[PDB]
Design an enzyme around this catalytic site. Structure first.
Site, mmCIF file in Angstrom:
data_model
loop_
_atom_site.group_PDB
_atom_site.id
_atom_site.type_symbol
_atom_site.label_atom_id
_atom_site.label_comp_id
_atom_site.label_asym_id
_atom_site.label_seq_id
_atom_site.Cartn_x
_atom_site.Cartn_y
_atom_site.Cartn_z
ATOM 1 N N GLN B 108 0.829 -1.206 0.000
ATOM 2 C CA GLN B 108 0.000 0.000 0.000
ATOM 3 C C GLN B 108 0.862 1.253 0.000
ATOM 4 O OE1 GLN B 108 -3.513 -0.299 2.617
ATOM 5 N NE2 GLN B 108 -2.459 -2.082 3.498
ATOM 6 N N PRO B 109 1.638 1.451 -1.067
ATOM 7 C CA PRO B 109 2.535 2.596 -1.219
ATOM 8 C C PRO B 109 1.929 3.992 -1.198
ATOM 9 C CG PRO B 109 2.176 1.594 -3.324
ATOM 10 C CD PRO B 109 1.601 0.644 -2.300
ATOM 11 N N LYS B 110 0.604 4.099 -1.286
ATOM 12 C CA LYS B 110 -0.042 5.414 -1.295
ATOM 13 C C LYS B 110 -0.802 5.725 -0.011
ATOM 14 C CE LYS B 110 0.574 6.608 -5.838
ATOM 15 N NZ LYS B 110 -0.649 6.712 -6.697
ATOM 16 N N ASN B 111 -0.639 4.878 0.997
ATOM 17 C CA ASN B 111 -1.308 5.057 2.282
ATOM 18 C C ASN B 111 -0.495 6.002 3.189
ATOM 19 O OD1 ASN B 111 -1.727 4.569 5.153
ATOM 20 N ND2 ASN B 111 -3.096 2.912 4.552
ATOM 21 N N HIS B 147 4.702 10.192 -1.810
ATOM 22 C CA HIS B 147 5.026 9.763 -0.443
ATOM 23 C C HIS B 147 6.488 9.319 -0.326
ATOM 24 C CE1 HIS B 147 0.653 9.527 0.460
ATOM 25 N NE2 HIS B 147 0.581 9.137 -0.800
#
Ligand SMILES: N#Cc1ccc(Cn2cncc2CN2CCN(c3cccc(Cl)c3)C(=O)C2)cc1
Ligand SMILES: [Zn+2]
Lengths: 346, 314
Positions: B108-111, B147
């Site tokens: 989940q790289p965009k959390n 991120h």
């Protein structure tokens, strides 16, 4: 093609109803989904299809009120939902003390925002508590966190803080001088505004920065004419057909608002190409379920449905109220907010 | 321990170790809004999570419960906060937590919550040894992940790891000279190390950019960098630049180049140059070229710029 108004109204109605477990990750931000839906219906002049009274109570049940001993002021505001299990209380009795219950800046913002849209007068909102909570969220560098327990801090929350202070018509919620300093330091070498100093300038953070200054009524005071010209150049360069968030990235419907609204605040949206923007936004419309997606033939969501509609509103789409580019609510709603402020000053 | 999709998974309400705890249900009141329906398994984990939270129980069983709550919903910031409280209270091995969060972020790289969690851990450990490589891996699946770049800049600044970033930037610009994130990183590194006041550095950079522009003339990022490092010094203070650009117009033309020229001419007018009326006409001629044929989508904008130049220098 054409704007499927009725379908979008139904789409927003469904957002307020019941969702499949596949949407669990929205639990702690259900209030912002409600905002997209309500504000979206308002924008389409269809708030009549919902029970304003029931929803107002639900929203008030999300307010973190100060306890009897007022020892939790630094944590007041609004929750995104009732995921903590605190007993339903529409801001009636005092606050039920809980080790981890506190507000979330984006929820306090969308919460107050929803109440105004629904017609409530904010009498049940403990204004001083919210402002105390807000102050506690600001960091030394002027930016804000979302919750008192700590979180990431950036321009997004500076915008939320600004909206809250504006709606409660009281800026004691922040150290404005430090916030302005943060916004200035976020300007990039390419002239756009980033989430923070040194980061890549972005359409979203540029909107947050510019809108915050406009809400504070200090746009002209903070940026020189030369600077504003550079920012305008950066922003208007974002249009490809629809708008993208940063150089060399594909367009996304929501930027029609993020960037478009910034251009509107800078008074040059009028010089953009309306047709290509409108055509792109409409191409991301889901003709079957309603709502808008970020790209054509993609799944729609509340956020892009709302921003797509607000983007259309910027060009005065037939059938959509005019949007207040800085507050992100209908002008009708901003006008009602004006009355409220006047009525308080007595 | 006991996975959520294990054949032998047991609801918490059926576990003996949880017998003493009374689960706490969520109640949205009479008329719920944007209500999400939950499966038995999901509601069960969170009914016990609420119980443990409400009592602020700093136990090992609670720590394991957060693992399940996170698997069900990694966007719940309260769960992550509580997990951090437990990590401290139980003095858990932070090196192990680094492995945990490393896997979560890859999925989940965009959390926002997972990146924040990793940053807190690195602050606690005062150990940035894994960071640059971890981020390079994430950037390998998405070279523009905001991120990842944010975290990378934080690590580099916080632990002064500037030594190899400019080389990393050069490597990525070769892979995709259009990545706006990398050009931003380049300016980040340079302005935080040598700065641009060193004429040898400025020259190296301006030359580097012109080379990149020659390779791919239609690249806003490269042009923005070039204008970015020179605009405050004064574009008109670089006579050879003006001519070197005018020599590119024939072949390597693009709206970015035309725009740059207009900006150079405008800087000149701003500094009471010679042939003010002649320069102004050179600018206006370009604005109209942009509006009518080179950057038509911004037709009204360029004409607006033109009118602005006339009413300011006549
Ligand atoms: N700003 C910004 C921004 C950041 C990332 C994006 C990228 N993006 C594109 N489509 C959806 C997104 C994700 N955004 C929606 C806006 N937002 C936000 C904005 C303002 C306030 C608050 Cl609380 C939240 C976010 O946190 C995440 C777009 C805009
Ligand atoms: Zn979007």
């Amino acid at each position: 093609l054409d704007f499927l108004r009725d379908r979008h109204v139904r789409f927003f109605q469904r957002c307020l109803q019941v969702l499949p477990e596949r949407y669990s990750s929205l639990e702690t931000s259900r209030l912002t989904i409600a905002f997209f839906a309500l504000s979206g219906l308002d924008m389409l002049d269809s708030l009549d299809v919902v029970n304003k009274d029931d929803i107002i109570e639900w929203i008030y049940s999300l307010q973190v009120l100060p306890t009897e001993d007022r020892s939790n002021l630094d944590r007041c505001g609004f929750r995104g939902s009732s995921y903590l299990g605190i007993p339903f209380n529409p801001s009636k009795n005092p606050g039920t003390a809980h080790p981890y219950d506190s507000g979330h800046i984006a929820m306090t913002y969308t919460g107050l925002s929803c109440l105004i849209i629904l017609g409530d007068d904010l009498s049940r909102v403990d204004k001083e508590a919210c402002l105390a909570g807000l102050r506690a969220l600001q960091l030394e560098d002027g930016s804000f966190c979302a919750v008192p327990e700590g979180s990431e801090n950036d321009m997004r929350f500076v915008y939320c803080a600004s909206c809250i202070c504006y709606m409660l018509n009281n800026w004691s919620g922040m150290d404005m001088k430090k916030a302005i300093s943060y916004i200035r330091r976020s300007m990039s070498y390419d002239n756009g505004l980033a989430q923070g100093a040194g980061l890549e300038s972005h359409g979203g953070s540029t909107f947050c920065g510019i809108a915050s200054l406009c809400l504070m009524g200090k746009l002209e005071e903070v940026f020189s004419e030369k600077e504003l010209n550079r920012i305008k150049r950066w922003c208007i360069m974002r249009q490809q057909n629809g708008y993208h968030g940063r150089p060399n990235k594909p367009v996304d419907t929501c930027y029609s608002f993020w960037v478009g609204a910034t251009l509107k605040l800078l008074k040059i949206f009028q010089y953009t190409n309306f047709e290509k923007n409108r055509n792109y936004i409409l191409s991301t419309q889901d003709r079957l379920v309603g709502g808008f997606a970020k790209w054509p033939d993609s799944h729609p969501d509340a956020l892009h449905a709302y921003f797509g509609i607000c983007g259309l509103s910027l060009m005065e789409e037939s059938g959509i109220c005019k949007v207040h580019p800085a507050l992100n609510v209908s002008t009708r709603t901003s006008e009602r907010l004006r009355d409220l402020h006047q009525s308080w000053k007595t | 321990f006991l996975s959520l999709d294990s054949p032998t998974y047991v609801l918490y309400r059926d576990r003996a170790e949880w017998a003493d705890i009374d689960p706490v249900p969520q109640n949205d009141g009479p008329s719920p809004v944007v209500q999400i329906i939950y499966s038995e398994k999901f509601r069960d984990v969170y009914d016990y999570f609420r119980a443990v939270l409400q009592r602020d129980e700093r136990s090992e069983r609670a720590f394991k419960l957060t693992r399940d709550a996170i698997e069900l919903n990694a966007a719940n910031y309260t769960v992550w906060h509580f997990r951090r409280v437990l990590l401290r209270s139980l003095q858990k091995d932070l090196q192990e937590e680094m492995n945990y969060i490393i896997a979560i972020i890859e999925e989940q790289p965009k959390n926002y919550q997972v990146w924040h969690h990793r940053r807190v851990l690195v602050e606690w450990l005062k150990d940035p040894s894994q960071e640059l490589e971890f981020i390079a891996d994430i950037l390998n699946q998405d070279a523009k992940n905001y991120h990842a770049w944010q975290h990378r800049q934080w690590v580099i600044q916080e632990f002064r790891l500037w030594d190899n970033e400019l080389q990393y930037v050069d490597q990525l610009l070769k892979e995709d000279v259009r990545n706006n994130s990398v050009w931003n990183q380049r300016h980040f590194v340079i302005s935080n190390t040598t700065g641009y006041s060193d004429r040898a550095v400025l020259e190296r950079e301006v030359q580097y950019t012109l080379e990149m522009i020659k390779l791919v003339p239609h690249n806003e990022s490269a042009w923005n960098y070039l204008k970015g490092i020179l605009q405050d010094r004064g574009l008109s203070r670089y006579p050879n630049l003006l001519n070197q650009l005018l020599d590119l117009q024939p072949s390597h033309s693009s709206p970015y180049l035309i725009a740059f020229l207009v900006d150079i001419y405008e800087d000149m007018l701003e500094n009471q140059c010679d042939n003010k009326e002649d320069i102004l006409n050179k600018a206006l001629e370009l604005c109209e070229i942009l509006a009518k044929e080179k950057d038509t989508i911004r037709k009204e904008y360029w004409r607006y710029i033109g009118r602005s130049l006339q009413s300011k220098h006549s």
